[PDB]
Amino acid sequence: SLKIDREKLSALGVKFSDVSDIISTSMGSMYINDFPNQGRMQQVIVQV
């Protein structure tokens, strides 16, 4: 588990939401929407 050093973030000048995004999205394997593959709507998954 991680310990986002908030002090550094503020000291570094980086938004917290951006760190959250990067972590969550870096591991998640999120699904976006469908696409027609040979007559059937199949998913379009993105992932690191």
Binding site: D34, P36, G39, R40, M41
Partner: protein, 48 residues
């Protein structure tokens, strides 16, 4: 179900295929039919 303004072929492949793939195995389902018309309405009669 109603998809306000879509080609019947899009409604079937997008709002009927899902229910079709899922609506099944319910208590004593005898046979289920589905019809998507011009006006963007898709109705599914499941007879038990």
């Amino acid at each position: 179900a109603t998809y306000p303004g879509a080609t019947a072929k899009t409604i079937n492949d997008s709002v009927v295929t899902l229910i079709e793939r899922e609506l099944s195995g319910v208590k004593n389902l005898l046979y289920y039919s589905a019809t998507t018309d011009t006006s963007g309405t898709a109705e599914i009669t499941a007879t038990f």
